[PDB]
UniProtKB/Swiss-Prot annotation, chain A:
Family the entry assigns: Belongs to the AAA ATPase family.
Cell compartment(s), UniProt: Cytoplasm; Nucleus
Source organism superkingdom: Eukaryota
PTM remark: N-acetylated by NAT1.
List of residues that carry Phosphotyrosine: 6
Protein name: 26S proteasome regulatory subunit 6A
Annotated binding of ATP, by residue: 48-55
Function, as annotated: The 26S proteasome is involved in the ATP-dependent degradation of ubiquitinated proteins. The regulatory (or ATPase) complex confers ATP dependency and substrate specificity to the 26S complex.
UniProtKB/Swiss-Prot annotation, chain B:
Protein name per UniProt: 26S proteasome subunit RPT4
Sequence similarity: Belongs to the AAA ATPase family.
Keyword Isomerase assigned: no
Chain sites annotated for binding ATP: 156-163
Role played: The 26S proteasome is involved in the ATP-dependent degradation of ubiquitinated proteins. The regulatory (or ATPase) complex confers ATP dependency and substrate specificity to the 26S complex.
Gene name tied to this protein: RPT4
Keyword line: Acetylation, ATP-binding, Nucleotide-binding, Proteasome
Entry's Gene Ontology BP terms: ERAD pathway; nucleotide-excision repair; positive regulation of RNA polymerase II transcription preinitiation complex assembly; positive regulation of transcription elongation by RNA polymerase II; proteasome regulatory particle assembly; proteasome-mediated ubiquitin-dependent protein catabolic process
Post-translational modification: N-acetylated by NAT1.
GO MF annotations in UniProt: ATP binding; ATP hydrolysis activity; proteasome-activating activity; protein domain specific binding; ubiquitin protein ligase binding
GO CC terms: nucleus; proteasome complex; proteasome regulatory particle, base subcomplex
Gene source species: Saccharomyces cerevisiae (strain ATCC 204508 / S288c) (Baker's yeast)
């Protein structure tokens, strides 16, 4: 758990209540969702100008839950060794098995994704490999709504349109 | 009199419990007395008592035979067991190329069935004819003279349940299923990238043809102009192995290849052309009648009120999503918490559908993936 709480921030409660409904309420209210059969949101999208408190607001919510936190950067998923980055996402949710109520954070969601087919250079493919892991792992044994991931990105302009689904990211928090 | 006797009767039950522990502990030392055994496949037959078996590490040696094995099964193409000391054949094991079970087993737990994928019935009855029928009564295609289809392409816009299509078909047939993610098999090794594809088609004969599944492959289907490729040349031989397998002289057509992807164009145009992939099955946005069957699916196990909406939910969201309804089921639970109600308000269900219109903003309009 970090040292940041909700008392150190103010005036963001409009955006904070959106975060409380993601990784906070579904964790404590999970007993209600099991009786109602309603699946909790698998994640929340965070964007805006880079100078916002998205790093602070996501940090204040991690300490209140008092659960194991995992930080994974998107640019770190690309390495010179092929398959090493694919094992990062594969082993990231592997720690969500032994410890079921965890929290995963992905910084700069726009760092990993693209199309790159038609035009020159034939793309790269040293990136999209770890992107397919994000689609496969969240569609695998995960998505028990204990795997909820905080997705933090800058803008919405450049992103993979396939990153948003009811099994990956639900609430889009502006 | 019986006080001292009952104490010894309870100890007698503990004596027999320790008797099983005595042999169990002695068998631990007996298990540690054994040595290791090398496993290899026979390459070429040098003589009757002299064979050439390739070790799992890649060197080859001339090994002998014993009286506990049959030389009829020691011929080429059969995996045998060697010795780590004198380099001789000891025992005989069944043939397994690279026994990776997590790739072979699909971990089937029944959740969604053909009734949960409903609304696609136009395309659902299309799949069962080229999948369930040839794996059940193959003589139907043999009487006409057509060959059974090998590959089947499942594509469409994201959020239509293409991932659930693998679990839906697997919940009925109940045969073996091999899940092979795209970026999980790209692990960099010498000759391993092209060997993984050779595995699934090699295990298809002993484990029965069943169905082989491919999950979201955006990679190997590229032309890959050379910028230096950054070590990805190992992926180029992966594409070559997939193309030569369909055109190979081995017996095929019984094993079904299910390959799903976000968009078809990223796949190899050599595969899209006939002769390899004969089946292109699109999963587009359902019609007005197709969505109606899906709302009852998500609201079935979820506790609802008898006033739950029927046909108005389709009219609320038009063109914004029209694909993934499950987003609406998650948003509807938050409106009932603020009002302190376990059951969902039918009016709040319509409000959750309206919220989804501003949730996506991902564009992704597909008119180009038809072909």
């Amino acid at each position: 758990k970090p040292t940041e709480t909700y008392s150190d921030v103010g005036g963001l409660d409009k955006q904070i209540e959106e975060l409380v409904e993601a990784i906070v309420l579904p964790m404590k209210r999970a007993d209600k969702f099991k009786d109602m059969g309603i699946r909790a949101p698998k994640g929340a999208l965070m964007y805006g100008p880079p100078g916002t408190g998205k790093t602070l607001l996501a940090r204040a919510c991690a300490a209140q839950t008092n659960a194991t936190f995992l930080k994974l950067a998107a640019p770190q998923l690309v390495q010179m060794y092929i398959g090493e980055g694919a094992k990062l996402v594969r082993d990231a949710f592997a720690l969500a098995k032994e410890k079921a109520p965890t929290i995963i954070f992905i910084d700069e969601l726009d760092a990993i994704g693209t199309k790159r087919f038609d035009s020159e250079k034939s793309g790269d493919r040293e990136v999209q490999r770890t992107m397919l892991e994000l689609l496969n792992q969240l569609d695998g044994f995960s998505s028990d709504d204990r795997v909820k991931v905080l997705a933090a990105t800058n803008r919405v302009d450049v992103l993979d349109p396939a990153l948003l689904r009811s099994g990956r990211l639900d609430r889009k928090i502006e | 009199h019986r006080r001292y006797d009952d104490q010894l009767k309870q100890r007698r039950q503990n004596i027999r419990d320790l008797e099983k522990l005595y042999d169990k502990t002695e068998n631990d030392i007996k298990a540690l007395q054994s040595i290791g055994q090398l496993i290899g496949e026979v390459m070429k037959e040098l003589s009757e008592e002299k064979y050439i078996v390739k070790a799992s590490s890649g060197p080859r040696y001339i090994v002998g035979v014993r009286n506990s094995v049959d030389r009829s099964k020691l011929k080429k193409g059969v995996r045998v067991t060697l010795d780590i000391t004198t380099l001789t054949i000891m025992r005989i094991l069944p043939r397994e190329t690279d026994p990776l079970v997590y790739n072979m087993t699909s971990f089937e737990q029944g959740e969604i069935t053909f009734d949960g994928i409903g609304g696609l019935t136009e395309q659902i009855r299309e799949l069962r004819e080229v999948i369930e029928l040839p794996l059940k009564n193959p003589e139907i295609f043999q009487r006409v003279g057509i060959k059974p289809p090998k590959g089947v392409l499942l594509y469409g816009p994201p959020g239509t349940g293409k991932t659930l299509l693998a679990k839906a078909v697997a919940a009925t047939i109940g045969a073996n299923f091999i899940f092979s993610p795209a970026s999980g098999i790209v692990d960099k090794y010498i000759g391993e990238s092209a060997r993984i594809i050779r595995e699934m088609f090699a295990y298809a004969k002993e484990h029965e043809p069943c169905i082989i599944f491919m999950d979201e492959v955006d990679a190997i289907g590229g032309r890959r102009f050379s910028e230096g490729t950054s070590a990805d040349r190992e992926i180029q031989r992966t594409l070559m192995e997939l193309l030569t397998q369909m055109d190979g002289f081995d017996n095929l057509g019984q094993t079904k290849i299910i390959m799903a992807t976000n968009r078809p164009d990223t796949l190899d145009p050599a595969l899209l052309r006939p002769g390899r992939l004969d089946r292109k099955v699109e999963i587009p946005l359902p019609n007005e009648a197709g969505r109606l069957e899906i709302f009852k699916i998500h609201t079935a196990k979820v506790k609802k009120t008898g006033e739950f909406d029927f046909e108005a939910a389709v009219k609320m969201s038009d063109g914004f999503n029209g694909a993934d309804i499950r987003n609406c089921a998650t948003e509807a639970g938050f409106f009932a918490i603020r009002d302190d109600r376990d059951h969902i308000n039918p009016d709040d269900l319509m409000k959750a559908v309206r919220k989804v219109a501003e949730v996506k903003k991902l564009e992704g309009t597909i008119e180009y993936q038809k072909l």
